[PDB]
Symmetry: C4
Subunit: 454 residues, 4 copies
């Protein structure tokens, strides 16, 4: 039993130095680290290319169809108008741009079919029925504008009574159309280009009824088969090319999953044997982390394989899984390196101070929450950094860590002398209090780290 | 007496564990915390909606009536002109916009009556009477421009001699009108919309006589009864809906007010009994804080009820009261949590260091004040962060805490070599001195925290 | 002798408590502090008003005379042009603005006479004589354009051969004129307004010969007697009103100068008497500071009196003197407050650590200088924060104190891979090294502060 | 042997104080420091002048030839267009500007000859041959436009079929021309001006095929003999003027190279003699640094001499060498100053803490790398500070040092609720973890610095 206990606590390198036991587990771990990092890098590069293409196309569309587009979104919406003729001009400009799409576009862009396979432009409007007499119910009417209708020498659609919008009753006007684009940037690699279908919606939203309508542009994009295309170049097989690399990563992490599970079981067996002799110290906390990382890697690889198989363009859950898995993989490198045993005093303090810091954070947290609520309720309407609770929390965290305090002082509005005076008291007290609380903490931590060690 | 003293110092949880005394006071406190937080959140959301509507309407008005409005206020004033024809253009543009208000506005906006119930536009001008011969007295003359006068094919008002402004004598020109607006964004909730009355004043202020006039736009808004309105929807009763919740909050805090007062009296009775036996340690400093929070909550709730009853749109004192009350409520959570007694070393340092830090702040404060005065007097005309004493104080506080020093160095003007050289000496000495003073402080605090504990 | 020594070391408050000696010196010091602070505040407010008026007039002039002025100076120069017709347009626009000055200006502005008392416009140009054949010598020719010449229906001046500028030889074109302005903002206070004379020069400088000319606008302003003015209002006597307050400040500081000098002499007498008994500890270092502050205050008050007497508009040396004097006055408040004697441990560390910090700064300074030189020589042409040595020093100081490091990393140009790679090594090494050096310092300071006290 | 050992450990000043040995080595070192610093300053000033001239000319060219140039590069490219007619307008505007170059330019600029000595304009275009039928191969065709062709009353070139660009197949359009410029700013110093030849290329690059073409402007400049120039002024000899100063610097550092090498050999001889008596402490680590600095200075001086001899305009390797040499020279000043021996406690900690900090950095580095990878993979497409791995590393380093955290929180896109929630967890955990790890480090360092010294 004593021989087994010494062997289980022994480091693999010294296991080979004394017992000549080959540490295949360490090599498997290193291989897993390398494969996970390589897979993450490849996935990141591919996503970078696809996302860059889609965002560039969206920017080009915004420049083409939005009237007087500056080049930067004013907020969550691209642009806004404040006058009836301005809104009319924006709508008519968007419609007229779509008609000459061929003469204007600089890229490989063409007209796309709708759900019922028809090239055209659909515009819908919403109003409260008059029945300022109005009713809560809304009316929705849409008109389909084909390319033939827009091509007519007399536009006609413009003279239609459909466009007489009663802005006082208007809710929103939405313009939707489909476009097909091909990225020739990939043809150089002899890799057959992948056609894209863009579903664009322009929403002239005035739901607020505050005298200003907001123009939203959304461009949903997806990959489609390049039926209408003829290039001297090879097709794509890289799908199956990467399909084996992902499978190998799954197998390697699956092996590491069982291997760590078997080691935990053997540890439990030894503790039972030790307990019989003597009728937390046996469960490595670095094995459960490895198990979690393996599970996350397997899930992320499965999601990536599913995304690649179905030619999906959304990689948010898979990316999160892969990133967390890689982070956990690198903390295991810390574990292995620490085998040197020249890391002790630091580890000790990290265990001694953890309860004290956790107690301090619980106390400081209640002051922080109250300050958050007070700041949001008082400086909410007068400060841009205090508009909502989450923003208040982030601003207070930054202030606690020494960031952007002068901007916080400056961006207040002196239009209200009562609020301005309170803000100075609010900001000065908060910064002074948390500096002092962090002061009283370090000194205590130090005084106690001497009692425990000396 | 000894039994009573042990009971008064005993924690409520252990009181129930040993004496089986139900801690209804703790439950009442928790209930009060929950109600106060909920009330604050509801008030904040309602104020957010109302303030957002009013600010959006103000922005729309600024875009409509101010000529060549960029979209952002140049300062406390919205825009400014430097030429006589520019000022004439701005005034005439504002007047002409008001005439076609219906054809231009995108929201539910209509003309409003003035004090004497008349739809029109009033413009007033101020001049020093010539009597560069001029006098200190000013003359004020106003002309009322009805919609009929503006509707005339020949404007007329423009050809009037009233508009011949002698800019060399001009003080200001003010344009005032009334508008009525309805927010239909609330009709979806079946809640009858609340009509708004906007009092707008456009001031072309050239009081400085510095070759530049400043254009101010102010939009005072208030809620009015929707007489001219017909919507299939229910009226509002939420007034009385919230009127009971505020009353319950008042009752709960009123109960906590007497309960803490009774506890203090009982503590005083026990100290008198203790003093008779033995012919600060008895007044919880966490009871006076609770009493203050209760008073602030009661005052804020009364103010909120008054504001809701009279349909007022200004919530600055009530918001301050509620925020401070919530902050004080959350420090009581610290008090209760601290019952664990595993918080000691920190509390000790916080009492030992308080006199030392207060002494240090008194010394550092006198250097800080002198540096503030010197910076304001020297770098006042050459630095934007040193224009006035309050700004100097805020800038120096930020510099003491490591914020925006490079910007402070850069935003000086090298047009004066004497001031530029002084600023480098001023900034370098200030930062170095306060770093050293904070250095000499931490080391002292630490050396003494050992003498007191060890 | 022992009685005298105890008396000289005794605090004034205890002197009155025991010997009943009235501390008139302390009262005189407090009075001096109050008077100095009040004088500084008054001077600052007056300078603020005058400077604000002059800067507003300069901004108005820039808007009036500079063609296409944005509202903010592009650098040390207001605007710039890159095309010959643009330069011609700017020059002609400036000249034409001056002609209609009356119809355009919004302030009380009129034409001013030149040195020889003549209303007109002088424009000078510089060229290298052709003698690309050219010579180092320059030619200067100027033409005077009176208001009569500009008023002519056919401008004429424009058709003159004087304006045929050979840009390839041009050095600069300068336009100078005089204007007279009155600030009526002061007439409200019944204080007679002070007339101003503006000397404006517009320089079209192309000295660099780099394809871009820089347009400089300078507006020298000075106060003149309001001969052409008639307002129902009183004249100014506040000159003599403040002339007594400054005289009283001089007398008070003169008294404090001799009083501290007499105290030092008495201290020297006591040390000589002490030395005879026993055949730095006697010279308060808080008396030489008071003497320096008194001298600075006297000099600043004399300069302020001279400036007020001669109606000067430049207050840079006097402001510096007054600010430094006020700063030194407030450090004496620290001295007096410290009489409490509860400040000891801090003072001790401040004396123990001073040699150690001075030694550390000498070492860190040599690394800092070398890093400054390397950064200026390498990242000089590729980084805006490393253009010149002073900017490099300020940037490195800010980096040492944790400020704007991410901006420092980002604002480099990747056009050169060699410089970009070096910058990462340069920035990473500098930040890491100085963090470690400050680390090794605090620990040493602390270890030694124990040896000296314990 | 004991006498020799005491002499070798003895400081030069005390060597002269006792043995009267003149420290010519110290004087040689000081001379070397002075010469190196002077050479660096001179080189920096000359490079500043040349670089400023070239950059100003490039800015002028961008303003002249790029249509609608704002004044600041939108990125790595100067400007961009999104419409076919916009691209046509930009190309035609560039060509038309070149034709009237003389009437437009404000500087001494003239037409330059191409490789075959011909004044003209070359424009090349790239397309995939149609053979959306297209092929991977590209076609390149160029047309030479002489000044005579552009001068024709009927432009002609514009009506040519060459300009019919099929944007759907276009790769890029490049316009190249040569210009000759002279800087007359130097003629004042009587120093003959140096003529410059500018090779400018305008690239209308649409390689991305994303609906937006990017316009690149590159201006390669080099010095040429001023054949076409006649100024009354002297030629340049400063080449040989500085050629001796650089030679002297080389000789001085060459002498210091052998002198330090000889000292090391003598140290090795003494250690061998010491070893025979007793049958790291002898190799100054401040001699190898001096040797490295000498080698770097010699290499940099040789490179500078080569650059000056061949009139080259690129100074990036030489500048790096000189800067590193100067930095190493200033660390030797630290070495000499340290002879005072009042620097001990600091040096001690710097040796005691180095292993502990190196161990801590190895551990913190693995967490930092994992966080870098996770941030790049997750927040890559949604945050501008996480676009690529290097940017992620710089952002995380800045966050570790307290910089721009609030901006990091704010610049995320809430369009994805999953990514937004992860970012808050990602940022909060990273900042909290590294603060705690740095916390647990300082306390450990301090506890151990007591064990080693006390
Ligand atoms: Cl994580 C951290 C980093 C830097 C400084 C501080 Cl004060 C902290 C905190 N310790 O306690 C909590 C309390 C809740 C967010 C703050 C306040 C947090
Ligand atoms: Cl609150 C604080 C936070 C961070 C750093 C410092 Cl130095 C302080 C201060 N301690 O003393 C006072 C003195 C008056 C405002 C400054 C200077 C203040
Ligand atoms: Cl003043 C100061 C404040 C904060 C941090 C530091 Cl490192 C310092 C310095 N101590 O040494 C000198 C050296 C010369 C300017 C820096 C480097 C200065
Ligand atoms: Cl250099 C430094 C300065 C300030 C704060 C810290 Cl945490 C450091 C580091 N110590 O460990 C490494 C790890 C790799 C870059 C960071 C993380 C670095």
């Amino acid at each position: 039993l004593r021989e087994d206990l010494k062997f289980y606590f022994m480091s693999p390198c010294e296991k080979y130095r004394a017992r000549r036991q080959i540490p295949w587990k360490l090599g498997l771990q290193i291989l897993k680290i390398v494969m996970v990092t390589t897979q993450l890098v490849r996935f990141g590069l591919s996503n970078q290319l696809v996302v860059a293409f889609k965002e560039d196309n969206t920017v080009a569309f915004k420049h083409l169809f939005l009237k007087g587009y500056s080049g930067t979104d004013e907020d969550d919406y691209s642009c806004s108008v404040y006058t009836q003729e301005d809104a009319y001009e924006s709508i008519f400009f968007a419609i007229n741009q779509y008609h000459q799409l061929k003469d204007i576009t600089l890229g490989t862009l063409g007209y796309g079919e709708n759900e019922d396979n028809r090239i055209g432009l659909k515009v819908c409007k919403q109003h409260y029925k008059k029945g300022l007499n109005i009713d809560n119910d809304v009316e929705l009417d849409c008109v389909q504008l084909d390319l033939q209708d827009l091509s007519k020498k007399p536009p006609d659609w413009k003279n239609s009574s459909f466009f007489r919008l009663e802005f006082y009753r208007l809710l929103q006007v939405e313009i939707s159309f489909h476009l097909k684009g091909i990225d020739l940037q990939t043809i150089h690699s002899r890799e057959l280009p992948d056609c894209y279908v863009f579903q664009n919606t322009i929403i002239f939203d005035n739901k607020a009824h505050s005298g200003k309508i907001k123009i939203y542009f959304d461009s949903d994009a997806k990959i489609e088969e390049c039926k209408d295309l003829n290039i001297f170049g090879s097709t794509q097989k890289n799908a199956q090319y990467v399909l084996v690399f992902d499978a190998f990563v799954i197998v390697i992490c699956l092996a590491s999953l069982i291997l760590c599970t078997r080691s935990i079981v053997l540890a439990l067996r030894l503790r039972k044997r030790f307990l019989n002799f003597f009728l937390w110290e046996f469960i490595n906390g670095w094995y459960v982390l490895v198990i979690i990382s393996d599970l996350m890697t397997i899930i992320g690889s499965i999601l990536k394989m599913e995304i690649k198989a179905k030619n999906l363009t959304n990689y948010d859950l898979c990316s999160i899984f892969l990133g967390t898995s890689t982070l956990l993989v690198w903390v295991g490198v810390i574990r292995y390196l620490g085998y040197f045993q020249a890391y002790n005093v630091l580890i000790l303090t990290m265990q001694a101070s953890l309860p004290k810091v956790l107690r301090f954070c619980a106390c400081a947290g209640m002051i922080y929450l109250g300050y958050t609520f007070c700041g949001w309720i008082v400086l909410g309407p007068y400060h841009d950094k205090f508009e909502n609770l989450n923003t208040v929390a982030e601003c207070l965290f930054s202030l606690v860590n020494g960031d952007d305090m002068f901007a916080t002082f400056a961006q207040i509005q002196q239009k209200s002398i009562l609020v301005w005076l309170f803000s100075r008291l609010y900001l000065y007290s908060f910064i002074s209090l948390f500096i002092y609380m962090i002061l009283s903490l370090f000194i205590a931590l130090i005084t106690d780290s001497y009692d425990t060690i000396k």
